Amino acid sequence: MGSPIFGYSNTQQSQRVVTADNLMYLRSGFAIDAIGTTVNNLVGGPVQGTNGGVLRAPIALDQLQSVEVTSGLYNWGGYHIVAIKFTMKDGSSVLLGSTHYASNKKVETYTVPQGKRIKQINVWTGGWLVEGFQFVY
Ligand SMILES: CC(=O)N[C@H]1[C@H](O[C@H]2[C@@H](O)[C@H](O)[C@@H](CO)O[C@@H]2O)O[C@H](CO)[C@@H](O)[C@@H]1O
């Protein structure tokens, strides 16, 4: 029915439906600031002051093979998802976020089953960073 919940799920859950474009959008910097499925519906912290991260190139979810999600105690506070490495079906990968500004880190690895379309992304945020996310089929 879906992937595990990566990271943590204690904060507020928002749900984002994957459109026909099959795209996942993120804002990231030293951690993961926001996740969405369009440029307009990202869930996470606001862009204010020096916070919010940068909007990255979208992840093509139909070309996605696996994720490597790093979570830990972020240096500026709290447990969140701080880095995600997306590995595509061609063997290339993109690393968003960082593993260098957090301690007490854990790594969760998950491979999208062949021929299963991700229809929805659940995201847990407390209004600053992304604490967790989940793929749903
Ligand atoms: C590494 C990076 O891309 N830094 C960008 C920086 O990110 C800040 C902050 O905005 C983020 O919320 C946190 C957590 O990811 O990390 C850093 O502290 O934001 C700048 C603009 O706000 C960008 O110019 C930096 O590239």
Author numbering: 821 to 957
Q: What did the authors write?
A:
β-prism folds in V. cholerae are not unique to VCC: three additional β-prism domains exist in two biofilm matrix proteins called RbmC (rugosity and biofilm structure modulator C) and Bap1 (biofilm associated protein 1). RbmC and Bap1 are related multidomain proteins with overlapping functions, involved in the surface attachment of biofilms and encapsulation of growing cell clusters.
RbmC2 was crystallized in the presence of N-acetylglucosaminyl-β-1,2-mannose (GlcNAc-Man), and the structure solved to 1.8 Å resolution. Density for the GlcNAc-Man ligand was observed in the same binding pocket identified in the RbmC2/mannotriose and VCC β-prism/methyl-α-mannose complexes. Alternate configurations for the two ligands were built into the density and their relative occupancies were refined, yielding a ratio of 65% GlcNAc-Man to 35% glycerol (presumably from the cryoprotectant). The mannose moiety occupies the same location as the α1,6-linked mannose in the mannotriose structure, making a similar constellation of hydrogen-bonding interactions. Coordination of the disaccharide by RbmC2 resulted in a total of 338 Å2 of buried surface area with a contribution of 160 Å2 by the mannose moiety and 179 Å2 by the N-acetylglucosamine. The N-acetylglucosamine moiety of the GlcNAc-Man structure was observed projecting away from the mannotriose binding cleft. Interestingly, the centrally located water molecule observed in the mannotriose structure was also present, even though the fourth coordination site (previously made by the central mannose moiety) is missing in this structure.
